[model samples]
Every structure is written in C-alpha cells, then in structure tokens.
Target: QSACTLQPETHPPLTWQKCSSGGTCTQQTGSVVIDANWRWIHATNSSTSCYDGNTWSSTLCPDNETCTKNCCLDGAAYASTYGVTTSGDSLTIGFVTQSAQKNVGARLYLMANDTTYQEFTLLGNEFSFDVDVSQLPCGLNGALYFVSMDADGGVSKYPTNTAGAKYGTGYCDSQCPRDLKFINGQANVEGWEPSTNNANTGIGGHGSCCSEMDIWEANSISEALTLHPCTTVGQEICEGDGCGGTYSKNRYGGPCDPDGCDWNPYRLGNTSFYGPGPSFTLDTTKKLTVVTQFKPSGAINRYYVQNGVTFQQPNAELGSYSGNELNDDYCYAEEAEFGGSSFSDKGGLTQFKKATSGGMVLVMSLWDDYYANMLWLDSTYPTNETSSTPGAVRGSCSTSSGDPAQVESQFPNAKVTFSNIKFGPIGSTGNPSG
Candidate 1:
C-alpha cells in the first residue's frame, strides 16, 4: 500500500560466499527479508488490522484509493512470527508458526542491504547451496528459484510503494500469484475471493507476472528443475485467470507458460538417483550440496555432491528424445512427449536466456500446494491412479498425499534449511565429493 507503518524491520543475519575461477572465495555479508504479503498490514496509527485472515477490513478498505491510503505494511517480527533463522552461512525456515496470527510457510529473498535485494546474474554462472530437507515430508516444497523482480522492490517504479525491498514489496513469478495483497502500489481488493484450501488467504483482483527459473523445487522424496518463461519482462500486473498459470481456471490461457519444461530426476527415468533410501544414489536424510549451471549457450545442467563424490545428472530417455541438460532439445521432446506446447508457445530457452541476461532476484520458499496437492511434483498428477502414461509418476509419494490441511496439521514442525550458498563462474565453486 501507499503508507508504511513505523514498526522496525530488521533482516535476519546471513552470509554466503562468492567464488573465483581459481577456487578462491570471499564471504559476502547479507541478510534475508520476508515477503511483504505476510507482514502485519494494519490501519495507520493504530493496532487495527487492515487485513484479517483472508478478508480485507471493509471498514478501512472500502475502495482501492481509500485502502491504499488507509492501510500500511508493517515491519515483520521475523523469527517470532515467521520462523526465520540464520546461523553463520545457514538459513532455516519453519513450516508453521503460531503468533498473534498463524503463519504457514514463508517466502524470503537474499538482501544485499536493507533497501535492495541481492540480484544474481545466472547466465554463464553457477549457483550452489547445501540444503537439509530431512525434516520435510511429502506435500511440502522447499523451493529455491530466480525471478525477474526489481532490485529495489518496485519502490522506484511505483512511488506509492515506499516500503521497497526492506519489506519485500515487489514479488512476481511466472505463476502470476493472485493472492498478493498489494500490486502496482494499489490494494488488490476490488474482486477478492477467499481461497478454498487456505483460510488465511484469498485471491485478489490483480496478479503480478514475471519470468521464473526453478533451480530446485523439492522434498525429501522428489525434486525438479523447471524454467517458466513469461511474455512480460520484469513486473506487470494482469487482470484475472486470463493471466494464466496456477490461479487461473485455464492454466495456459495467458501470456506466460504456466507448465514450463521441467527436468525431474524421477520423471525423466532416473528414479533410483534421488530419494531417501538405501538404494538411492543420494540420500535425502542427510544434507547434500546441489549445483546448477547456466551456460551461455542456453543450456542448464544439474549435479550433486555428497560424501566427497560428484554425480552428474542422468540423461532423460523418453521415446526418441533423450538428454540431461535443460536445453531446447530436451524441452521440445519433454513437451511433445508429455503433451503441452506452452513451453515453446511462450518462448523457450531463448526467452529464458533473455530473462536471465539482466540480473534476477533470488527467492527461497517453503510452501504446500493448494492446487493438485503438489502431486504434480511428487506423485501422479491429475488424479491418474493407473500407471499407463509416460512421465505420469514423478516420485514415490502416494497419489493421495500432499494435502495441505493434512500435512500442516500432521507435520506442523516441518522445516527446511539452506546453507553454504556459493555463486561464481561455472567451474569456480565445486570440488571432489563422494
């Protein structure tokens, strides 16, 4: 909204390493800032909540103009309210937090300073992180991705957004999330509707759109790397389901490719490669380092380092199409084989390169899917109990698993920890691993 509360906003302390070609590294002091959507938005100069649960405070927000001026985005309480913690190089976030309001999951970014988000130019570079997902279960996603968001968090572009990056004001993804409380410096309450799955959230009239790259979206049982490209460049607000992606009734009716070309180890015929098992190549019960490289040639490669050994990603051999890296060829085959043309229709790897050519903001989140129950990543999606289609099963998760309400209640203490983040030229970060 236009006004911001006087509440203090301090980032959770964090540190990561920037590496050079010769294996030299230096510490980069930084911190993490939670997204503005989860903050305590309230009436200005009072403790009155402007947004309660999933409904807008009609008393304070009768219309867009009035709401923009009346309500303010207050600073977050961090660990106490959102369960965000940083110790040395590690950053940990909890699944559920109970305060004055219940906070489920969290979306955070690497902040270079109090005012600006840390932008990572991934093309021709590699990004690596050590993550512990042992405590996570099915139905939850601990995601690390990149999106084309303004470094200043739209404060400069949208003058009414005075809070800026300090409060995580600007957040957009290929999904074009409609649950955002504010968009384009205005209150997104004109045509709001409560969510069926979530009681504390609802869909707003406006949805923010941007290109997104999913380096990792996973649980202990399954993992995937995807690229969601958008027609809009940085940040643009779309009207409704016409914007496409997750919230829309028609997932591909809009400009962006909602179902991007994904390279999942399990879906691509590498079932035994990743999981928590005695036969699995990489055990998820322990912390492991994941490496992703974005080559200038518009190709993406993934690998893992565990027990002092390096393991390259296995190639995908589905029908006549076979490859490991996320290039044009693999995307073409995957889309053709899996059934969808949204990837190429919305601009494939070429657009991905364009989106990353300019710097992109890094985002890390832990959330459960309300739609499809996260079966899209873990189990057979679209309720296909039979195992006939190729690429139907993504993981060992049961088809009925990933229910948000059940998972939240059953595993309220679920958490994910990401640590030892490093970024630099392609070969600068990794070494020998078991």
Candidate 2:
C-alpha cells in the first residue's frame, strides 16, 4: 500500500517537466521516456500542452487540460524524420538525400536483413514517392525500384565482388529480382538518335530509349544450375565439338556454358517485360512521381506523374508468370550511370509472383558504363556510321577516357538526391504526407 503525505511540498514540486514527443524528460527521481502520451504540466497554474510526435502542439491540449491518449499521429507526422515510420495506418521509409560520385555505389536506404530474410505483408498494393531527378547527371542511369534476394544464399545487396554486384553476373546475381523500376533514361552521342539501326542501343527518335518504367525477374537457382554444364579440366565433358571460345566448362560445381559458367543466367538472357508506357525524356527541371499498385487479383498497374501534373498509366502490364505473382521478400530503388566506349548490356528484370513477396526498399546509386564511354555502340566507332555493330569495339572509342572515380573527379558536381517516399493502399493519390 502507498500513502501520499503533503509535508510542506519541498523543492518547488520538482519544476513540472515537459518534453517533445519521442523525446526525453527528466524527473526529480529519475528519467522518463517521453512519447505521444507524455505532456508538460504546469505545477502552479496547471497549464498544459502535448507533443504530437513531431513538435509541441498547444492545439493538442487546451490550457489546464490533459491530452487525449488517442491523438493520432498521421503519416506526415511520422515522415517528419528519416528512417522507418510505422504509425497511423501506414508504414513508410523516408530518405533525405543519397548521392555518390561516378561509378561509386551508395545506398540511400536499405530495408533488407543482411542476416535473415524478412518478408513484409503489405497492407496495400499502392506505392508512391515524390522524388526530384532534375539534378541527376545526364547520360547516367537513375532508377526507383525494388529488389529481393535469398538472404542465406551469400548474395549481397551491394553486388561488388567477382559476381559483379547488382549489375553483373555473380553469385547472388540472378537470385535477386527487380520488382519495379522507373528508369531516368540515358543520353546518346551528340546528333545521334534512336532508329531501327540503333534500337538495340536503347536509342530512338523519341530521344533516349532507356527512359521507361518496368518490372524484372530472373530464373530460379535450380533452373540456372541445371541449364549450365559442370565439367572437369581433364574430363571429356565436351564431346564432339569440344569446349571453345566462351564455351568452357565451369571448374566450380555451379552451372556453366560454352562461354564459361555464368552463375546468373537471367541477366544474360534478357528475360524482362518492357513497360506499357512509351519512352519519354524526363524534364530535368521538374520532379517525377511514380506509383505502382498491385491488385488483389494479382494484376500490377503502374502510373507516372510528371511534375505532379499529368498522370500517365503504363501502356503495358505484367501478370503472373507460370502461376507466380510479382511478390518477393525484398524491394529497392536506385540511380546509376554506365559509360565507356559504347553502351554495354543494360540490366533486365523478370516477372514472377514469388519474386516480390519479400517487400521493397529504396536504392540510389551512380555508375559509368565502360562500354558506352568507349563508343563501341556509337554510330561512329569503326567504319560504317549507318550500320550497328554490337560490341564491335572494346578500347576507348573516343578521348572520353576514365573510370567512375576519375569521371567523378573531373565532374565534382555529379550527385543524386531522393525525397518524399510513401506507401499506402492502391489507387491512393496526391503528394506524400511528408
């Protein structure tokens, strides 16, 4: 039993402490973890105010009154700060700004578990974001998308090893799938445009061909291993027409082909469904808003909101493949640049339900394409400027020589920024709460 005794009320009644929501408050005896429920009360006058999880709000509570425990914290309130916000009826991840130099890889925000794979049962199929790509470098690759991979498979979210990171063929390479992607497009050589001759290069009369939104998936690990041939150096795995250029047996137990064993064949096979939306250049001066919605029936719809004005739906759509929907355990968004002598192989995505069940994240990056910089795919690399010869040239096509690091040094202003990320029910519109 506890009894309260009023013995002259010593020490000025502890000076009535108050703090902002999610902040800290100290008491004469100890400390209190201040949250939305906490309030500052005036000892003498009984004046009071409540913290609304963002700031101290006088409107939250009347003078000489207490705050209601049910004062809701909206999505905007949770988005006032960076990182994950699981308040109200929505769950969102906020990113202030993520940038990097040429060829350097940087992660804006990651929701993936480096140890164990965790799947998020999303409440809704709608996803939206208010992002500014006006400052993105031209001729570079920039994207907002989601990626999922098996956690125990030794596949790294940042693919930067012998397997080639996210853009290369490596161990965790094909195991991951890009659920959704809004490409910012790449630039072509001066005076060059997209034509039937250059369609393979993502260049067309519409401008740069890479500017589009789409979804990507890859083959399963088992299928990939089965398709590849494993062989020993001394063994006769190569019968009649022995192993030749690029078609050698893989010393490792993993899959192999005549062109050696590529652990990731999905990227090698170009197995992706292009968006129904027509390719259009992004207005560098304006922001771009992209929304992706998944239907209860397993249909996926994509929308493009440019400068917050016009909303365009994808001309094409992606449905379940082989009974698998576009649901995976992980998702991500990013920005990258590839340049060299010519345009190299751009990344691809597959369509499958199980690929996207894990959920999504935001990824931002900047990288240069070695092939593009070398002008290998440019119209003027070798002799015939009218015809297209894929990967015809290797060395530096023009004097535009340097790696991502060097390019960044030459162009110090190169960087990218992302903002206003939101997740909610499908078909929901308007700017993000934050």
Candidate 3:
C-alpha cells in the first residue's frame, strides 16, 4: 500500500473526503490534517494535484495558506526563479534551488524588461563575475561572451545580407553570427583518456582538444588579408604529362600573380591562452573570478582569480583590429558543454570587437550533449548507459551518467551560485573577479 501524510493549516474546522479512482471527490474544506493509506483521487476544488501511480490528489488548505506542487517531478509547466540582488557596485545572482536535472536550459536576461533592454556599451571596457562552481558537476564547460542581433533586418540564425556592410557589425554564417565566446573547461573525454593507437576508449568520434579558457572568433570579420603569388620562379606554371592536358602548378607564391591568390577565410580560431597541464585546474570546492576588459579601439583583455588569488596582467588578449570590425550591437555570456560536437565552418568572426558594441546581456545555463563525450560529472564514463551510436536520440544526463531525473533522485542538493557581478571601468575595483 502506498501511503503519504498531509499536514493541516493552522485554522479551524475542516472536512475530508476520500474517493475511488476515476471518481469525483468532494472538496475537503480545510484546516485539517490527513493521515491515511487510501489511494487519493482528484480534488474537486484545488488548483494543483499529485499522482503516485495509483491516484491523483490535492492538498486542500485555508484561503490564507499556500500550496505548491512539485512541478518538475510531475512534468507540469514550470519555471525556475533566480534570486537577484544588488550590492555596492555589484549584482548578485543567487542560488534559489538545486537543478532539477542535467540538460536543463535556463536563462536570465540582465535587462529590466525583455523588450526595452539595454546593451553593454564599451564605456569603461571592463566586466567581471565571481562564481561559485564548487558544486558544479565535474568537467563542466562555462562561457562568458557577447553577441548581438542583426538589426538591419530581423535576427536570422546567422548573419543577414546586410551584416558586414555597416559599422557596429560584421558578417557571419549559420552558427556563430556576431559572437565572441570565452569558454572554460571545454573538453572532450576521448582526448582526456586515450587508449592504444590513439583510439578513444569511452566513445569513438567524441573527443576534442582540452583547455581551460579558449577564445573563439566568429566569421563576420575578414581574415588578415594578404597578397601572395600563386606560382614560384622555379616551378612550372603549366606541365603536360603523357595523357594529361596543361595543368598549372598549384603552389603558394607561384607565377599566377595577376590578381594574387587569396587565402580562404576561417570561421573559428583559438587564442594564445589555451592548453592542458598543471597550469589549469577546475576545483569544484573553490570560487572562480573572471574579468573581461574591452576598449573603444577594439582591444579585448581577460584576467582571472582563483580563490581570491589575483593574476597580474591579462591572461588572454584579442589585439586591436582595424575599422569597425569589433563594434557590434549585442553581447551575451553563457555556459554550455557540447559532448563531441564539432563547431566548424559555422560563421566564426575574426575579432572579438566585431561581435560587441559594449551592450551585452548575461546568460547562465546547464545542458548536456546527445552523446557522452563531454562528461561533466566524474572522470570515467558510466558503462551501463549506451555509448553514442549513429543517429541515436539524445537524452538528458546527470553527473553520474543517468538521466537528469535520476540525478535529482540521487543528489538532491546540487546547485550553482553566482555572486559579485560587476561592470565598470577597466581599472575599477569591482571590475575584476576577486
């Protein structure tokens, strides 16, 4: 027999009724305590209800009392609330509750209103966030970046036709339009634990290079355009073999220099400050501070602090660029982990400046990939779960290699908290994560 207890409100007389499955139960007038083993049917007058495989029921309360249902467990329409507060020169995004499951996506816009939101302009060129990741699942990936929408037309998935022609913007492809991402712990497990012959022991075709923080430029900006000849003085421009017609030598700086050869542009490229080794570590028990500085002249710099220890000088820098390449109209910060997913040819820009004109929003989220390549929980991938196969449907996952629901069942107290968020001048005290 499945049984549950219901506590009463602190009022007066009450009435209780029990009904059979599929039967209409009379509304229990409240201020009463119920302790029974009978299967609870639906309540006639309550707004919320719960099911325990056998029946659904509601906890009736007085008009002054409150009632809340576990909406996540019930698969009901639900929304997560963030506790936002402001201190002296800093904004705090507090932790309200533990995550319901992995692969859950949540977002909070920094603007006061969704329609009339303001963007982060490059006034002082500095911003910082002090985050407590001690409770974040292992191997998690976090991002602090900026993005803008295509204002000339409606925001497309990528850059519209009018993207690169004006100031405060550039061109982009399908994936990353006007965007710059500062990614942390963006890693794949196959590279973390390689087997013999460079084979991946966990899952094949699901590994990526590891790093602490990597800067990704979008495709809106052009490459450093250079002029190179197509043919060399010693190399033959046209050669006739036994059965072939004339074939020009395809070499850099060769003789085909009428217009010169233009190198194909690249969508994504890494910054100088990225790699694996003892230099970077993700300590879940400690706090991490990240500072990003921008300049009107299109220079970007990053600084870091771990557990209150500050690092002098910028850890990463996107050097100044010419023209209006860096002055985009939108920006955003995010956190995500793509397990073995590839980000190639997806409209990466050349400079960080092209993606932001200073006005940017803050976004925080937790998600999972369809595959288990980017394991955010422990070092080892769980064996009981199915390894990624071709065209397999992706499922939500927890740190323990189970579904988010299962993870919530196992670790009910997991949560991520953010504090000390500040945006100000480059040299301001609250501008760096300390």
Candidate 4:
C-alpha cells in the first residue's frame, strides 16, 4: 500500500493513495475549493464512508472505506472502499496453444487478488480461468508467472508481490499419449521430447543413445498404490537409494518403495542401484507415475525411466554399450554402477514382494550385467542437443530403437509377454500372484 495527497495550489492528478480515513470529493460544479486531508491507516472496521467534504455527516459503507478530499484514485470504487483490503486490484492473462504432437492443457483461475488457482484438463488442449478478487483486488502492483518443470514434470507457480508477502501453488499432469509428436503421421513413439528426457535423466539407463522405457504412467491414486514390477521375468523395482544426491526424491517424492541404498557405504559397488523393477498399465482413469532409481553418487553411471520403459547407461560416457548388446540383454538395470563386479544383492536385481499395508504391491529388484554394455541411440547421434542423456525412443537407423513400431516389429509378442507379467509392491519378492 502507498499514499499521496492533493496540493491546494498546483494539484496534479493524484495517483498513489494509502489513507486511513477520508472522503473522495470531486468538483461537481463549483469554483470555490476546500483543502481535504488524506491519511494512511490499517483497515480495521468492516465498513466506513467518507463525506463529500462539504458535509460533516458520515455514510454507512462497506469495509476498507477511505475519504478523498477533491478527487478519487483511478479505478477506485466510488460508493465503497476496496472490498478486501488485502486483495490487489489488477490482472493480466496469457496462454500458449497445444500442438498436435502434444496432448496437454492447463487452466488458471486468477483469484480476485491476482493470485492463481491452476487446473489441468489432461486430454484437453486449452485452459483458462477467471481472475479472482476476493483475496486481492485486480490491477494490483504484484502478479504471478510460470516457472520451469522439475524432473517429475511438475511446474512451480511464483508470485511477484512487492506490497506484501506472496504465495503460489504447483501442478503436475501426466503426458497425454496423443500429445506425443509424430515423425511420419504416426505418433513419434520412438523418441520423447526434450522435456520428457530432462524429466527422466539419471534414473533408468546410462547417459547413452535411447534410454530404456523403464518408467510407468500411473493413472490413479489406487493404481500408483497397487502397481509393482514382475520379478518373475527378472524385472524388479528399485526404490530410491538416498545417496545419489537424493536427486529426484529431493524435490518430488520417493517412489512408493524408495530404499536409499545409494546411502549405504558398504554396498558392493560404489554406485547404489535399483532395478528394471516394474511398470503399470496405461489407464486414462488414473494418474501416471514415472519412476526412476539412481546408482552411487560422486561416481559415473546414470539411468532413467520413461513412459513404462527403462534406459540404462553402464559408464559415464554417452551410450557406453552398443545397441546389439542392449538388445540381447535379459533385463536393463534401472540403477547400477560402472566397472563394478556383480554381487548377489549389490548390483541391480529384479524381485517382487507384497506390501503388508494399504494393499500396496511391493516389487524388489536384483543386479544383472546383461545390458551392462547397452546404449540408447538418438535420432541425431552427436546432436543429442535435447539434453546430456539420450531420449527414450531411438531413431530407425540406430540400434537403440525403443519405438513402439520397432519394438513391435522386432518383438511382436512384447505386449503379450508384458501382459502376463504382473508387478507387486516394493518387497513382494517378484510374485504378482500374491
């Protein structure tokens, strides 16, 4: 809140105002003028009114009433002071359209005070909301702006309020399969966008060509709770190991079963590991959960999980292993260390266990050297400009092809094989039947 007064001699259109008590008086049709005083005070009463400077009597008014001497501030209410003193009095609106290759929409309601209430339409393309004024009036001095998304695809909302303390909220909407870009009229099922890669780095596969699709998209709170990996097929769930700098879990949240193995100093390999744990079925009825596990920190090796697949990186260098090696491997390590020998429970492994509480499906993972030399190739090899790590989908010419068509063409029964596999909670011991 600010303040300004009108001078009796050289009076200019007074813009700023922060007064305790006074009436806004306008020269309706008189040459004679009177000096009106303005004051600033905290709004205490619910309603107050100002006299037209000529009248000594007061009028019953709404809360936050102030008196003006000869004029009123621009955009100020005439009969009443601002309804809610704490609310601002201004607002602005802007938006970006969704592309055919992208399937997401966001709506924002501008609270009366210029604050925001966000809503994601999921499959919708456009998003909009009315500005709210109950909290603060519109046209205030402060406002809000959108910030970048974290590794979990969650966007942070920030407020720029100079008058007083400000507040905001965040929103996360799973990526719509339809929003995925297409290369040739077909959904770009091969590779994800730069944003998706940024979201899954250092969780699934090595920082190579095409990171494995080790992640799952949970559609609902229940699905996220029940979903687990099928350790029977050697696929396991690697919970977050606290060490690896606690990267992903530091901000978002730990996977349903984060073990923090990376924090263990005596863990066989220097790099802590998780697994090609499990994946959830794509269900529009539920929210999606993209899960990734990390290996030892302060060392090389990184992995990521995208959509419902896993990508692995055995060494520090990009695409440490060749595509042939990756294709032949039985299972990709969701989290693993480089140059580390295999240990029973040290490296990455795949197993399942049932959760005792909340009906959560507990899936555990083990270590394997199968795809230890595997690499995920991108459309543009050296131009992996999207990010330091490779994208989930691979190019046609490259061997790191995690594309739907490629995977289908290569392994026609992949879906059937995946369907038969069921995931359990973190410690289910690889038994979906239980």
Identify the candidate with maximal lDDT: 1
Give the range where candidate 3 is weakest over 10 consecutive residues by summed lDDT: 177-186
Error of 3 at 383 (Å): 13
Assess the local accuracy of residue 181 in candidate 2 as a C-alpha lDDT between 0 and 100. Answer: 10
Candidates ranked by TM-score, best first?
A: 1, 3, 2, 4
Clashes of 3: 32
What lDDT, from 0 to 1, does candidate 1 have? 0.87
Per-model RMSD to reference:
1.9, 22.8, 22.4, 25.9
Model 2 / residue 425 / CA error / Å? 2.5
Residue 168 in candidate 1, Cα distance off native in Å: 0.4
**Model 3 spans > 4 angstroms off:** 1-105, 113-115, 122-124, 139-145, 149-283, 295-299, 312-352, 370-373, 376-408, 429-434
Q: What does candidate 3's lDDT look like per residue over 84-183, in tens digits?
A: 3333323333222333422132222233221222245543456666655444443232323333322221213222212111111211111110011000
Candidate 2 wrongly placed segments (more than 4 Å): 1-103, 112-124, 150-282, 296-299, 313-351, 371-406, 429-434
TM-scores for all predictions: 0.97, 0.36, 0.37, 0.17
Name the top TM-score candidate.
1
Tens digit of lDDT per residue, candidate 1, span 1-434?
65455668889988898888876878899999999888888888788988887899888998877888988998888889999899999999999999876789999999999899999999999999999999889999999999999999898788688878888888989888888998888889899888876888898878999999998999999999999888876888898977787767898877788788898889877789989866889999989999999999989989999988889998778656676777888888887778889989988999878887888998999999887789999998767554578778888789889888899899999999999999999998863211
Q: How far off is model 2, as Cα RMSD? A: 22.8
Angstrom error at residue 32, model 3: 38
**Candidate 3, residue 266: CA error in Å?**
24
User: Residue 76 in model 1: shift from native, Å?
Assistant: 1.2
Q: Which candidate model has the greater TM-score, 2 or 3?
A: 3
